[PDB]
Amino acid sequence: DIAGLTPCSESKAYAKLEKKELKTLEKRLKQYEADSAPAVALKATMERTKARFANYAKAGLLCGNDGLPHLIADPGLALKYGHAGEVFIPTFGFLYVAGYIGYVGRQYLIAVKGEAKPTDKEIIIDVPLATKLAWQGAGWPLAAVQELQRGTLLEKEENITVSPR
Amino acid sequence: GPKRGSLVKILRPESYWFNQVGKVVSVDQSGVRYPVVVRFENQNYAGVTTNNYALDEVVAA
Amino acid sequence: AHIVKIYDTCIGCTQCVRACPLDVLEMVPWDGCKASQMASAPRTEDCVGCKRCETACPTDFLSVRVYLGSESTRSMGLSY
Amino acid sequence: PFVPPSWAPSVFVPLTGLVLPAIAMATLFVYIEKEAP
Amino acid sequence: WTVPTLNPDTPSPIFGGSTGGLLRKAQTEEFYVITWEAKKEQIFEMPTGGAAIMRQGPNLLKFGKKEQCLALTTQLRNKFKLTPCFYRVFPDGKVQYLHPADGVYPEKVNAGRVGANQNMRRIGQNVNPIKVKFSGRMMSPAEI
Amino acid sequence: MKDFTTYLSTAPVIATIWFTFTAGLLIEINRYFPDPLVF
Amino acid sequence: HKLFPKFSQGLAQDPTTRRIWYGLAMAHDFESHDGMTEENLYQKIFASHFGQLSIIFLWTSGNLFHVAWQGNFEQWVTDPVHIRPIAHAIWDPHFGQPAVEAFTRGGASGPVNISTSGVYQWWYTIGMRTNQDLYVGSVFLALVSAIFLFAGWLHLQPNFQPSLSWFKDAESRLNHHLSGLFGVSSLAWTGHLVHVAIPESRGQHVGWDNFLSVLPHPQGLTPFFTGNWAAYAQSPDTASHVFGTAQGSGQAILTFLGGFHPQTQSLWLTDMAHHHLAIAVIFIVAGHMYRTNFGIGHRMQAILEAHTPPSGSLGAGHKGLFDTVNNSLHFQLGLALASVGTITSLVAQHMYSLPPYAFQAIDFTTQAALYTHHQYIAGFIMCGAFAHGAIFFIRDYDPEQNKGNVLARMLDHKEALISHLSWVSLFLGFHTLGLYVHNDVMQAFGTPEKQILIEPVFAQWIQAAHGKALYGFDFLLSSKTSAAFANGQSLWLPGWLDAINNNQNSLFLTIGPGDFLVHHAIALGLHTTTLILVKGALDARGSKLMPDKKDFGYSFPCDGPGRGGTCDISAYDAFYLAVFWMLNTIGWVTFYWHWKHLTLWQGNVAQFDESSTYLMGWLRDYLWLNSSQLINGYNPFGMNSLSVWAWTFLFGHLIYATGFMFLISWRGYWQELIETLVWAHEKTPLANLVYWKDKPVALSIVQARLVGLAHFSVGYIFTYAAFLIASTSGRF
Amino acid sequence: THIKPSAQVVWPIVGQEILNGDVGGGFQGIQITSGFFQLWRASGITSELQLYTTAIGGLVMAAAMFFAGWFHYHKAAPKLEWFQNVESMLNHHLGGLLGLGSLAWAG
Numbered sequence A: 001d002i003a004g005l006t007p008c009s010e011s012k013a014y015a016k017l018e019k020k021e022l023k024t025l026e027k028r029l030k031q032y033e034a035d036s037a038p039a040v041a042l043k044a045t046m047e048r049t050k051a052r053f054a055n056y057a058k059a060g061l062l063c064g065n066d067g068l069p070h071l072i073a074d075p076g077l078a079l080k081y082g083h084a085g086e087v088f089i090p091t092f093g094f095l096y097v098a099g100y101i102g103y104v105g106r107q108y109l110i111a112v113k114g115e116a117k118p119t120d121k122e123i124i125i126d127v128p129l130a131t132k133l134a135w136q137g138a139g140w141p142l143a144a145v146q147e148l149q150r151g152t153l154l155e156k157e158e159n160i161t162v163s164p165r
Numbered sequence B: 001g002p003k004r005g006s007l008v009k010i011l012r013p014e015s016y017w018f019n020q021v022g023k024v025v026s027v028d029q030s031g032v033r034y035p036v037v038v039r040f041e042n043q044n045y046a047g048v049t050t051n052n053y054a055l056d057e058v059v060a061a
Numbered sequence C: 001a002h003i004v005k006i007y008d009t010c011i012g013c014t015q016c017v018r019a020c021p022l023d024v025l026e027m028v029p030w031d032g033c034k035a036s037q038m039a040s041a042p043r044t045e046d047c048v049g050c051k052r053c054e055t056a057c058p059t060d061f062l063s064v065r066v067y068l069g070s071e072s073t074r075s076m077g078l079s080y
Numbered sequence D: 001p002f003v004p005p006s007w008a009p010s011v012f013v014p015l016t017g018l019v020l021p022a023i024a025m026a027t028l029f030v031y032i033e034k035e036a037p
Numbered sequence E: 001w002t003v004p005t006l007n008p009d010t011p012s013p014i015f016g017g018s019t020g021g022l023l024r025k026a027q028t029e030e031f032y033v034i035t036w037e038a039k040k041e042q043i044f045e046m047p048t049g050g051a052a053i054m055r056q057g058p059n060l061l062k063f064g065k066k067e068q069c070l071a072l073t074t075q076l077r078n079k080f081k082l083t084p085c086f087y088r089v090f091p092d093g094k095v096q097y098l099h100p101a102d103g104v105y106p107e108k109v110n111a112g113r114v115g116a117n118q119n120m121r122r123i124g125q126n127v128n129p130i131k132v133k134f135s136g137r138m139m140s141p142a143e144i
Numbered sequence F: 001m002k003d004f005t006t007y008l009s010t011a012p013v014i015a016t017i018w019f020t021f022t023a024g025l026l027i028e029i030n031r032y033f034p035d036p037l038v039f
Numbered sequence G: 001h002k003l004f005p006k007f008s009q010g011l012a013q014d015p016t017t018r019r020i021w022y023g024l025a026m027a028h029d030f031e032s033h034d035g036m037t038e039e040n041l042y043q044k045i046f047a048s049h050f051g052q053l054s055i056i057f058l059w060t061s062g063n064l065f066h067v068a069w070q071g072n073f074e075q076w077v078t079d080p081v082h083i084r085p086i087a088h089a090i091w092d093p094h095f096g097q098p099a100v101e102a103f104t105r106g107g108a109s110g111p112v113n114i115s116t117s118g119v120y121q122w123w124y125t126i127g128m129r130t131n132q133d134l135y136v137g138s139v140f141l142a143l144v145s146a147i148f149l150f151a152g153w154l155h156l157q158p159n160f161q162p163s164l165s166w167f168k169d170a171e172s173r174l175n176h177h178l179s180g181l182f183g184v185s186s187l188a189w190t191g192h193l194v195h196v197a198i199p200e201s202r203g204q205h206v207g208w209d210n211f212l213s214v215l216p217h218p219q220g221l222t223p224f225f226t227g228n229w230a231a232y233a234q235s236p237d238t239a240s241h242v243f244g245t246a247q248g249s250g251q252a253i254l255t256f257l258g259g260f261h262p263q264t265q266s267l268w269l270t271d272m273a274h275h276h277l278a279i280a281v282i283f284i285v286a287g288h289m290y291r292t293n294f295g296i297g298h299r300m301q302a303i304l305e306a307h308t309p310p311s312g313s314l315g316a317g318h319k320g321l322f323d324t325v326n327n328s329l330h331f332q333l334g335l336a337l338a339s340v341g342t343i344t345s346l347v348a349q350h351m352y353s354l355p356p357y358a359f360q361a362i363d364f365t366t367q368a369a370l371y372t373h374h375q376y377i378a379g380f381i382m383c384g385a386f387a388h389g390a391i392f393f394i395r396d397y398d399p400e401q402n403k404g405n406v407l408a409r410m411l412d413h414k415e416a417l418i419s420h421l422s423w424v425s426l427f428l429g430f431h432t433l434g435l436y437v438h439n440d441v442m443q444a445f446g447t448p449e450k451q452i453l454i455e456p457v458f459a460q461w462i463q464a465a466h467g468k469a470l471y472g473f474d475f476l477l478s479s480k481t482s483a484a485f486a487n488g489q490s491l492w493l494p495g496w497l498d499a500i501n502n503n504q505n506s507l508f509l510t511i512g513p514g515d516f517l518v519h520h521a522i523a524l525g526l527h528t529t530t531l532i533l534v535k536g537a538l539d540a541r542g543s544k545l546m547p548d549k550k551d552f553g554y555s556f557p558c559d560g561p562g563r564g565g566t567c568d569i570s571a572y573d574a575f576y577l578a579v580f581w582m583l584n585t586i587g588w589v590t591f592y593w594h595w596k597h598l599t600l601w602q603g604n605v606a607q608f609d610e611s612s613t614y615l616m617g618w619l620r621d622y623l624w625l626n627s628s629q630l631i632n633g634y635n636p637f638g639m640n641s642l643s644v645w646a647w648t649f650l651f652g653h654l655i656y657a658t659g660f661m662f663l664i665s666w667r668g669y670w671q672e673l674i675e676t677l678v679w680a681h682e683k684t685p686l687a688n689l690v691y692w693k694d695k696p697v698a699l700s701i702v703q704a705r706l707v708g709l710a711h712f713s714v715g716y717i718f719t720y721a722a723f724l725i726a727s728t729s730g731r732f
Numbered sequence H: 001t002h003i004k005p006s007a008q009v010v011w012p013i014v015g016q017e018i019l020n021g022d023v024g025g026g027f028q029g030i031q032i033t034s035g036f037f038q039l040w041r042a043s044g045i046t047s048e049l050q051l052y053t054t055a056i057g058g059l060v061m062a063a064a065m066f067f068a069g070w071f072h073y074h075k076a077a078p079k080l081e082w083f084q085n086v087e088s089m090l091n092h093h094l095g096g097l098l099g100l101g102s103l104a105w106a107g
């Protein structure tokens, strides 16, 4: 398919690796009882192994010569061959939660600078104000692009600068 | 220059609080070279929060 | 000898003088500050360059500056 | 007429290994420790 | 105030003898001699390590470097309220008084002192190092 | 009790509680959704 | 006082042992000597340059002489596949008879060293066949070295010292160095190739005896003056040509074929001839650009004053930069070091992948040694470029001459620069380390199918654009219906396609997720080293912690414990901290190079493709695995030829470790220890009759950093050199 | 002689379950090397119940130690001349601690 990679459900080293992990787990399994808790834990392990290999073969991942899933990081090639779930949807999910954390921290900083003890509200966290901003932070991309377009996202050149500049 | 308690802006370039805002304590009326006493709410690396400045190093902003 | 200089931002707080472990600095009459005092460095041949004076100076930036220069037996702090 | 003889390392390797370092370190030591007028 | 003279026949503090005393610098180059007058017999701390008893009256110690005499001066001045003065002695026998060189201690202003090494400008008003290239030596822009 | 809540509002205690919540949330998600690599 | 050093009486009046070290260290810093003017500066630099040239030609004549006398060159050229290249003979009276038998390898009388410098391949490709030829070359280059040393002595003499106007003439120096030093030298090397090096590969000896009576081509100069230049491309060397003989030869002297000679797996001599001829013409034409004493020509100050864009987006543009490049030697030195370092990286990257010399790339230890040698040279030269740029900012930069130009505007947005470099370094570090630690946890927990293996689709796209039909993109050189394919297909693409689709060479190696992760780690190292070096250059004038850093110079220890303490605040110390990141980054690129090539040379590239994606696979399958025959170089059962590399391996570990002592422990501890030593010597009877002339003191702070970095670096270099040479030579 | 001492087990999440190895005795865990098993066999402990009771006892003693800390700082805090009775402290620690300790242990 992409880059000479076969799909994992078509790959043979993928099936060999699945069979090898089952072989190691059953060689460890064959030295216990039946209803014993080590045997129960190893059968749960084998169930999770089979479920994991079936889910990775179901998700349409691409395997190499080693039988291991390879990820495709190109928006157009991923959206063309059905691989947006591995890099593209995770990167927009990450950027949503990372801007969430950063915007809630920025709103807490701006809220606590407007008092007579900003360092005291930085050492001892104002929990109601922090939870208020943490719930209100869900509209952070809209609020961020609005603060961008008003010219209030950015401080002017009243910043601290060195002698050189 | 500026009166007591008013906010100024520091333009001495090698100051720690250059391009930032402090508060005037007093202005000495002798022939002292740096009469404007400004306090800053943050400390420098020496842990000092107060410095003398000149009339053309402070701007009432 | 180390190059020690005094600048006109001095407020005559005498902190540098009482911080020097070598008696290099001293206070002289002056009119540039309210204290009517200025530091001076008449004995820089005995200066080792420890910079306790610079640590003790309150002004921002420093009004006393130590430029490490050519070494002698007194500036290296040798007892031998 | 280029090949140096078969005894040549037996002289040249201890020469620049011992004799010229001894002469060079003695000469540089006397040059370092020399007083100015 | 006049410049005092060194009395080499001054009794020394009671001290058993350290390994941290003088060396060949005292015989070849210089050593320094510290002198004070005590009010009572009292134990102090030697700057070279150890304890010593000062006598009641004139005392006399001799050290290698200058910071040892400053350390003992600071101890005797802040802990015992004494007024010592220490000199510089050469193997010729030349005796150089100092500290307090004016007679008044340098931590207070005295009329008659000439200000030395005073740049009459800020530190930010110094020139760039391009302006002091190719003099007779290495120079810093604060030297001019 | 007010001072005990101020102590619980101090920085290392809130870092401990919040990282315990975040780590437990990720642990719970990795238990009920075992081994996720995509989507 | 004392005489040494004569250039500084401030150091000559030092009563301590600091005088000797600081005389050794400030000897070649001519801008800070006593009584130094600007003409004297340029003249002593000119003499030192001649000294450097004489040392380089004496080095080359010595390599030639020791090969010609103690090697096996004439025996190597008969079968250069199975015979090892001898460097020089060993005379060590500390040896034993097992060591003499072990280093007596063959075919030699006594103990020898086996060379890994590529000089036999280079000399055999350029036409050397006998030892006498190497003797003549050694005598010639020793005479050239004597001439350059004499020319330095001569241009120091007062009837021959040039004036300041001769040194500050940039148009004449660029015209003569582009047209003559590049163009005519490349043209004369083309002449050497056509007249000597190609017929020596055809099996015909063209020496100085008969170079005027042997035709380079059967129709000499008649195509060249008729314009029928394609008559020199007719009948090239056949794909069954035995190199150095007449079987399968041709008549062409200037082809354009692409790819490699089939036997030697190396570039064609006719292609290299054409290549040096074309670049010779281009450099001679480019050497007529600037205005000397002939009316025509460009004026560089006029060009710089003209290239200022509208709207003020670069301010004053390049206004006033000619008087700051011309007057500063540190700007010119930083530019030269940046260019030469990037070109040394280019030399290494293009010589592993496109091997020029006959039976290079079958000598794997030579491949690894030359790559690693020019990569570490390139890293040191790049760090020196940024160091002398910081020295330019401290010493030579006049701000009023540069009020508004590009150099001042860089100092204006230095904080944005360092902030975005800090961001890219933190990003690459978090995610590269996180992916490696993630894959290590997956490999530890028995689940390799969960590990994050991002495919390098961008560089695979580029390899498909180059003509590699492995990844199936099939475009621009990989698709047969392309304009670039069809236009280059008649003349140079049929060799390039075969060489790039061969998977048995280093020409565009197959890449995977391990290659992804390592190129990301490489970008981390580059951005991070650039962060420290750019921060040291731009904070050299001063920072908010120290506004007057320009008043202390380039290399001062610190500014004391005040203001919270200021350790390693100087630009020299930023350089010092960045040498570690240089060594780290080149260690990464050469670990990667060496392990991917060892897995290519053994045959199992699957081993690299599987184990490269996790750092335990690195530590287990490269460092633990390839040092099995190294450390068995000597043992309680005997020794063999690898015992010198085992000893040098431990030697490098020891020097590294000794450097850590100067790196961690600092001065005042050692100063107190030395004072107790001074007491003990002056009180010990019958040894206090002996007294020092220089007072013993501990090493200074800056000297301590330099000595620790020196031991650290030498141990780093010797350890990896011993490991690389010993693993590659012991297993191949 | 053929069972490896193990007293730590990991939960089956994110694959870390593999750390529970075959230590023998029909058990899976991490082999411990503190030597508590040999200490417990030497002390004559035979059942898990006795170990459980020792655990409860040690927890009770920990609560007693933290109460003792709070008590001797906030409620009844010893004087300096109590702390300076070093002769008495040596007598009580050499007799009572080491002496009665090793006597009761020999018992």
Ligand code: CLA
Binding pocket: A074, A075, A076, A077, A080, G457, G458, G461
């Ligand atoms: C980070 C840099 C980067 C790089 C090296 C690539 C590389 C690639 N892109 Mg991708 N792409 C990227 C980021 C990148 N992309 C981003 C950020 C977006 C969202 C804006 C896209 C959206 C995108 C689309 C919709 C497509 C690609 C495609 C490609 C492939 C061929 C195009 C090419 O060679 O242009 C070099 C790449 C750049 C100069 C970077 C800018 C990318 C621009 C914004 C889009 C280029 C699309 C191109 C015009 C389509 C060519 C069609 C092709 C059949 C010839 C190549 C592997 C094409 C493909 O699927 O090939 C099989 C394709 O259809 N890309």
Ligand code: CLA
Binding pocket: D004, D008, D009, D010, D012, D013, D014, D015, D016, D017, D024, G058, G059, G061, G062, G063, G065, G066, G088, G089, G090, G091, G142
């Ligand atoms: C400059 C590069 C160079 C290097 C690194 C070597 C290295 C070596 N030579 Mg070779 N040598 C060289 C050039 C070189 N040679 C040249 C060009 C000739 C022909 C004149 C020779 C003639 C020669 C002979 C006859 C022998 C060696 C031998 C050796 C080996 C032992 C060291 C020794 O005692 O040599 C002594 C060095 C010389 C005789 C030539 C040096 C003459 C130049 C002008 C001196 C340069 C000094 C340098 C610039 C600064 C060094 C001093 C400074 C650090 C204070 C060592 C491998 C010995 C050997 O083969 O052992 C197996 C041996 O017997 N060399």
Ligand code: CLA
Binding pocket: G056, G057, G060, G117, G118, G119, G121, G122, G184, G185, G188, G340, G343, G344, G347, G370, G373, G374, G377
């Ligand atoms: C700084 C340390 C350093 C060292 C020790 C080396 C060492 C080496 N280099 Mg490397 N190299 C370096 C830095 C270094 N290099 C840098 C900074 C660059 C980028 C400029 C290179 C670029 C480079 C290339 C491209 C090659 C090497 C090669 C080599 C190896 C062969 C020895 C040699 O160079 O012959 C000594 C060379 C000379 C004495 C000069 C050669 C002739 C010059 C170029 C032209 C002469 C013109 C002539 C005088 C004009 C006459 C005009 C006429 C009209 C009269 C040796 C391992 C070669 C190799 O790898 O072989 C296996 C090789 O091909 N180096």
Ligand code: CLA
Binding pocket: G024, G025, G026, G027, G028, G029, G030, G333, G337, G380, G381, G383, G384, G385, G387, G388, G391, G554, G555, G572, G575, G706, G710, G714
């Ligand atoms: C084109 C080449 C070139 C030239 C002409 C110069 C010229 C200069 N450099 Mg620059 N520089 C260069 C390249 C160059 N450099 C490179 C490649 C680097 C990176 C290493 C630097 C990094 C650099 C720094 C950091 C500094 C200079 C300085 C200087 C100036 C004084 C040199 C001096 O006095 O030191 C004398 C030289 C020494 C004392 C060398 C000591 C030995 C070193 C540490 C290596 C030791 C390893 C040892 C040889 C290995 C032995 C192994 C054993 C087993 C045999 C002089 C202007 C200095 C300066 O300008 O001060 C303001 C300065 O501080 N350079």
Ligand code: CLA
Binding pocket: G422, G425, G426, G427, G428, G429, G430, G433, G524, G528, G531, G532, G577, G578, G580, G581
């Ligand atoms: C393995 C050794 C090591 C590592 C990992 C680093 C990492 C770093 N160096 Mg350092 N450095 C090192 C050795 C190392 N260095 C050495 C030997 C020297 C010579 C003195 C230096 C000198 C040096 C300089 C001069 C600079 C750096 C900088 C950096 C940072 C560059 C940006 C980056 O990639 O950060 C990525 C972040 C990491 C690699 C850290 C990992 C983060 C961990 C995994 C998160 C926490 C994990 C876990 C929860 C911990 C729990 C433990 C608990 C007890 C709290 C990075 C943190 C640069 C910098 O600081 O820029 C901002 C910089 O300018 N280094």
Ligand code: CLA
Binding pocket: H042, H043, H097, H098, H099, H100, H101, H102, H105
């Ligand atoms: C001489 C002192 C001494 C020694 C050698 C022993 C030896 C032993 N004890 Mg016993 N024990 C002692 C006193 C000692 N006991 C005292 C005073 C107490 C009350 C606190 C105990 C309470 C105790 C318990 C509850 C247990 C043991 C156990 C053991 C055995 C386990 C290994 C061990 O403890 O390392 C050997 C210890 C040492 C080498 C250091 C002891 C030093 C003591 C504390 C100070 C003695 C100083 C002495 C005047 C000079 C000695 C100098 C130096 C050589 C030690 C071992 C036979 C275990 C057991 O019975 O297993 C079968 C066990 O469960 N001991």
Ligand SMILES: CC1=C(/C=C/C(C)=C/C=C/C(C)=C/C=C/C=C(C)/C=C/C=C(C)/C=C/C2=C(C)CCCC2(C)C)C(C)(C)CCC1
Binding pocket: G330, G331, G332, G333, G334, G335, G338, G342, G385, G386, G388, G389, G390, G392, G393, G537
């Ligand atoms: C600090 C300082 C300094 C230094 C600096 C440096 C050191 C720099 C470096 C730099 C560098 C080192 C840079 C680099 C660059 C590079 C580049 C810029 C490249 C480019 C390329 C290109 C453009 C290419 C393209 C292409 C391709 C890709 C493929 C195809 C072909 C072609 C050709 C098209 C100085 C002295 C100035 C002074 C001031 C200070």
Ligand code: SF4
Binding pocket: C004, C019, C020, C021, C022, C023, C024, C025, C046, C047, C048, C049, C050, C051, C052, C053, C054, C066
């Ligand atoms: S450096 Fe040491 S000696 Fe020189 S002035 Fe400051 S304190 Fe006095």
